[PDB]
């Protein structure tokens, strides 16, 4: 078992804290959903390779430009998160989060993750977004943004239903293992 480090970046509304919690518990909290995530070391076996993947959140560091980069040293894989129910989170990816991560984490693979995929066909989400001349992020819009920012890959998941969550972290492990 080799040790690798994962950091998740994105706007607070991207659901990054929830994603780390649901993955680390292999359960969406039934009684209480924690406000914060400390850290976790997940035991993962991907394609026959055992890895200890340390997980870190950046929530709470968004307004602190000198505190926030302290989470980046020795990162092996980045999860760049946006929420499918929020086109505004996707817009902050190419010129806010992407140049920051490429500066502090040069040559580190980035996986662009479209969170809350269960809201793409949610009637309440569609009605709410239509008030600001918006709609849920389309799969091609996510892939095109991932392609543009030089992401290693594009993935989607739902922390609510757990669909695609395990796949995201197993792929992040494969990317962290690459040369």
């Amino acid at each position: 078992a080799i040790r690798k480090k994962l950091v998740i970046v994105g706007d607070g509304a991207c659901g990054k804290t929830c994603l780390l919690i649901v993955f680390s518990k292999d359960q969406f909290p039934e009684v209480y959903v924690p406000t914060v995530f400390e850290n976790y070391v997940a035991d993962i076996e991907v394609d026959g390779k055992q890895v200890e993947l340390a997980l870190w959140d950046t929530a709470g560091q968004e307004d602190y430009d000198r505190l926030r980069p302290l989470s980046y040293p020795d990162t092996d894989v980045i999860l760049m998160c946006f929420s499918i129910d929020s086109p505004d989170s996707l817009e902050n990816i190419p010129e806010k989060w992407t140049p920051e991560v490429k500066h502090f984490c040069p040559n580190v693979p980035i996986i662009l993750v479209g969170n809350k995929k269960d809201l793409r066909n949610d009637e309440h989400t569609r009605r709410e977004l239509a008030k600001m001349k918006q709609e849920p992020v389309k799969p091609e819009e996510g892939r095109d943004m991932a392609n543009r920012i030089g992401a290693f890959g594009y993935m989607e998941c739902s922390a609510k239903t757990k669909d695609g969550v395990r796949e995201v972290f197993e792929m992040a492990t494969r990317a962290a293992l690459q040369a």
């Binding site: 009684v31 209480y32 406000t35 400390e38 850290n39 709470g60 000198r66 505190l67 302290l70 989470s71």
Partner: protein
């Protein structure tokens, strides 16, 4: 952590910590407020525990078992005693507020109605100045601590054996040297989200809503001040690089 506090905070939430017959007595809004206050205290207990690993297991073990050059242990764990003093005192205050609130005859059933004042006291006056001074010093020494650690692990045989020995037990899985340093740096930016969520469920008493609104502002002011006082120290950085910053 001491066994008494570990057991008091073993449950995933306040709703699972208290007896079910006591839980049934409160309105939904109170249970929501209490679950978030419990998360603030439980995470504070864990943060204090991280500082005890750094001071007792790491720092003191290196002083008592290794022959490192002077200034090396201090370089690895900057301001650890001051940080442990700030947070052990804050934890004592939170645990005393919980203790006074326990029902007679119970060691688990309680409701905390007045957290705002405690948070205002912690994030104002001398205690706030000390938190600001300590985190500004610690976070400016973060990169240097990591680089000094990496260099020692890769070049010093006895240091590497010491690290592998004390971090072998499973209860230290999440708490290696570098992980401890980042857990502490990240602690201060967890406070605004915990406090805002407590405030969300504290509208019932107007004075409590006001005190938590004041506490949230004091915490954000502290973070802004700490963030503005950071400049990473670099071992080997020449004066020219510094004054041409």
């Amino acid at each position: 952590s001491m066994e008494m506090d570990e057991k008091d905070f073993a449950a995933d939430s306040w709703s699972l910590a208290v007896d079910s017959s006591f839980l049934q007595q409160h309105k939904k809004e109170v249970m929501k407020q209490q679950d978030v206050i419990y998360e603030l205290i439980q995470t504070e207990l864990h943060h204090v525990r991280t500082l005890k690993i750094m001071t007792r297991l790491f720092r003191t073990g290196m002083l008592e078992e290794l022959h490192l050059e002077p200034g090396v242990v201090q370089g690895l764990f900057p301001c650890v005693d001051e940080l442990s003093d700030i947070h052990t005192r804050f934890l004592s205050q939170l645990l005393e507020r919980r203790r006074q609130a326990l029902c007679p005859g119970s060691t688990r059933n309680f409701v905390i109605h007045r957290l705002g004042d405690l948070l205002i006291s912690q994030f104002s006056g001398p205690s706030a100045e000390q938190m600001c001074k300590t985190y500004s010093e610690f976070c400016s020494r973060h990169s240097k601590a990591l680089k000094l650690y990496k260099e020692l692990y890769a070049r010093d045989k006895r240091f590497q054996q010491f690290i592998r020995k004390v971090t072998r037990p499973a209860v230290l899985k999440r708490h290696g040297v570098q992980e401890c340093i980042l857990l502490v740096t990240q602690r201060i930016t967890k406070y605004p989200l915990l406090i805002s969520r407590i405030l969300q469920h504290s509208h019932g008493i107007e004075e409590e809503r006001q005190d938590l609104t004041t506490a949230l502002g004091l915490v954000k002011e502290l973070l802004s001040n700490v963030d503005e006082g950071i400049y990473q120290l670099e071992k080997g950085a020449r004066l020219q690089e510094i004054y041409n910053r």
